Swiss-Prot record, chains A, B:
Cytoplasmic face residues: 1-304
Annotated crosslink Glycyl lysine isopeptide (Lys-Gly) (interchain with G-Cter in ubiquitin) location: K5, K90
Subcellular localization(s) per the UniProt record: Host cytoplasm; Host Golgi apparatus; Host nucleus
Phenotype upon changing Q189A: Does not affect ability to cleave and inactivate human TRMT1
Designated name of the protein: 3C-like proteinase nsp5
Amino acid sequence: SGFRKMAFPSGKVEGCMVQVTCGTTTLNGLWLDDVVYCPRHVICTSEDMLNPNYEDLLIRKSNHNFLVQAGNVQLRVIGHSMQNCVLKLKVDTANPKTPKYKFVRIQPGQTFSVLACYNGSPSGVYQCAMRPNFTIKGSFLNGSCGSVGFNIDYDCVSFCYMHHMELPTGVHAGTDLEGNFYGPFVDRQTAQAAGTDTTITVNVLAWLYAAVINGDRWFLNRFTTTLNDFNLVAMKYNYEPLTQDHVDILGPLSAQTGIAVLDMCASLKELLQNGMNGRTILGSALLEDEFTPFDVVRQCSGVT
Amino acid sequence: SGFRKMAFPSGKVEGCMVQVTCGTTTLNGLWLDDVVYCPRHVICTSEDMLNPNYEDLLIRKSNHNFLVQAGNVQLRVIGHSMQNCVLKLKVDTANPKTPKYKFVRIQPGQTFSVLACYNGSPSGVYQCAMRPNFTIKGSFLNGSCGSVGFNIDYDCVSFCYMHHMELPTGVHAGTDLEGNFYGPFVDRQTAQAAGTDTTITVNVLAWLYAAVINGDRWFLNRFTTTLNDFNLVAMKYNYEPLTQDHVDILGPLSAQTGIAVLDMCASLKELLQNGMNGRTILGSALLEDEFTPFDVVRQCSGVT
Ligand SMILES: O=C(Cc1cncnc1)Nc1cc(F)cc(O[C@H]2CC(=O)N2)c1
Ligand SMILES: O=C(Cc1cncnc1)Nc1cc(F)cc(O[C@H]2CC(=O)N2)c1
């Protein structure tokens, strides 16, 4: 029993973190096979960042200008390329600690673990969700650029996120491992707004199922609702509309608890309209939306 | 910016996890040098657990009865001993992945990372606090026994906790790496109550400093208080009394924010007496006590 915001064990990803320096700028790189991936703004100076012409900036850089350090060993750069907003530095040595890996572009509402790094060294690991507005509510400081987000499927690491920037909002923006930003963000030092963020409804329901599995049943009621009626309430409270696909994904949790999805929706409706009245669910005074139905099943079944 | 319940990178500890089987029971072991540490209740059957005589039970076990598996390789047991509530199985091979380590017995209120494991394999990592009542509010299932709690100081892992049991309360109890339980708990299948748990006052204040550092300043007020007056309020709300030692430990955060500790105490007093009025602090609708002042400094400064 118990329910925590759990991250994947980070060992496979720690063995991939390197330091990349270009001029005066130092950030984190991801070394997989003979390629080091990092945010392309490593080639910029503070004045370049206001309106950078990355193609012209990269043209003034040669293989010897990129310094790559793995722990205390210097890697030799033999190739360099820009793919969207990431640089691919070809090194002469394949990473002996390269785990089985994939590059995946996650969907908003999906979750992942972040290994926050500084100077090629890991400092901590935490669980995140890609928000519907394509930002992440992480914990990142100056020097954290190049830190990656991932998931693990038994032995295979699926890299999904590379950290690039913080919006003045305090929220974080970044790319997939092909350098494509999630959202409308650009790697330029200019005011950028993350659109309106919504609450991931399917995740809150999954967490209400995790609460029931853990003994927290006070919010359960004698009511039911319909997809259309619950959706009228979801739009009022900035909640993503619930679809039959979401209902299907909640199937294993509905079967495990014996509570039909539409009955769980009616508990959520009353929680939205009436608040929590000073009570808590899984040690929380608000409705949690950063646990997917897969996360709930995995945590409640002990998948290693 | 941003503030998350951050765990230490778990790679150094994943390289130490093994599976220990004794009869029908399988649990997790910690392999460091030529010794595998695990909870002593691995030698028990469900009937033995009601009132176990560990000394007599262990007498019926020989080195060959303990099966130790590291990934897919079988370790050879050449010695066995019981130290309080843990078994020390001497193996013929030293763990090549043994990091620099210490065994420390943490104080209540201090924090640590848990690498939850099943069958010698890690499933996730999360941050915990040792509660004033010596329990931890973890996420553990059957098979998770032997999972460890630790801290990392640059390259040195300080093992502080080994998971042994769950109380019917849903909270978790365990030992230090010498097998001494934190709290009054015994490794017997009998009703055990964790005493009254208090809120770690110094940690809530540290988190209020992390909130100020992150832009959340709504709770700051035009009031001040004294240690004695604030303590009258702390006892009313099941909060640990604040001492001058706690005030001193908050010194770096007080210097960084420019807000004197007694002024932060007055904000906490008004938050206790008036609640949050539907507002949040660092994305939370309740007062968080599982971040020490060291955790706040480390997260807000990027210590790797
Ligand atoms: O934020 C960091 C660096 C950093 C600091 N703190 C946390 N995480 C990252 N760099 C950065 C990189 C970049 F290509 C664009 C950019 O634009 C600003 C304007 C806007 O909004 N974002 C900022
Ligand atoms: O709880 C688990 C096994 C476990 C299950 N779920 C989460 N974490 C651990 N074993 C266990 C071991 C033990 F030596 C004593 C004992 O007494 C019960 C009575 C009381 O309270 N605790 C239980």
